[PDB]
């Protein structure tokens, strides 16, 4: 199998698999002495794959 040759394997117990990855990373602000530090935010995203029977 050329797919089994080139691709990456993944251990998969069930008929379905879930992946989650980082997507957004927090910003950063210059703040004056004693200024209010603005907030920032992290984010992730999900993907999934399923099996078929030959």
């Amino acid at each position: 199998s050329k797919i089994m040759q080139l691709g990456k394997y993944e251990p998969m117990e069930g008929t379905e698999k879930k992946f989650t990855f980082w997507a957004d990373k927090p910003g950063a602000y210059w703040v004056g002495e004693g200024q209010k530090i603005e907030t920032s935010k992290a984010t992730w995203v999900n993907a999934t794959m399923r099996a078929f029977k030959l």
Binding site: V31, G34, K36, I37
Partner: protein, 43 residues
């Protein structure tokens, strides 16, 4: 709450990166005899 930013918002020590010292004391006073005191004053 007793000190205000330029914009008028109260100071937040965490969000604004500040430190503050509070000192407190309790004190009590009693005059045991109101007659026991006298005063000399210029005319």
């Amino acid at each position: 709450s007793t000190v205000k930013n330029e914009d008028g918002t109260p100071v937040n020590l965490f969000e604004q990166d500040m430190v503050a010292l509070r000192a407190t004391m309790h004190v009590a006073l009693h005059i045991a005899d109101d007659k026991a005191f006298a005063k000399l004053v210029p005319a």
